[PDB]
Amino acid sequence: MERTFTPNVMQPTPLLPTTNDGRVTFGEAFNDLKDLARRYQLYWEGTILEGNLR
Amino acid sequence: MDRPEGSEERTVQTSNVVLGETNIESQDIASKEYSPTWDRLASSEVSDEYPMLTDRWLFWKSVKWEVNDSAFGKMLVQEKFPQSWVQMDVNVNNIPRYTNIPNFIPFNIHQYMRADFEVKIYVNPNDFVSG
Fold first, then answer.
1. Where in the cell is it found (chain B) (predicted)?
2. Testing the interface with A: which of B44, B48, B112 to mutate, by most A Cβ within 10 A?
3. Which residues in A lie closer than 8 A to residue B41 (C-beta atoms)?
4. Long-range contacts of range B58-61, CB-CB < 8 Å, 24 or more positions apart?
């Protein structure tokens, strides 16, 4: 499958040992964008005066 | 002194270097000794080791302290460690080089390094001084 296609690999060293997505060094894992999307962010913010209303 | 030879001198060997001592030492350890585990998480390239080169007891500085410059708190040595030791071979312009000392020869071709260290301090006074 082309998007992940990696032909004729040339790798000088072995892979880097894992930390389980940060769980070894910090106390938590970071492997899914869905988790970050569950941390609140600003959607909209504004000031309203009497003059903006009916 | 009670023998034809003076007396027995204790010996300590490492690589191809042999150190002799004659008295009971004063010892200490900077921190708890351990075997590293998180260094493997820092570099995917295999860590080379050169024990016959690095495990070698090497001679550092000699520093001369006299009666007339010996006051309480006088600093005979104040050096960044191990920087000052590994970089003790300088040129005409006081620029260090890792190319001549076999113990330091791995430092020239590697970017990152780690080790535990041991430091011995030798003073050979006569029988009639105090300090």
1. Host cytoplasm; Host membrane; Virion
2. B44
3. 16-17, 19, 24-25
4. B58/B17, B58/B85, B58/B101, B58/B103, B60/B85, B60/B88, B60/B119, B61/B88
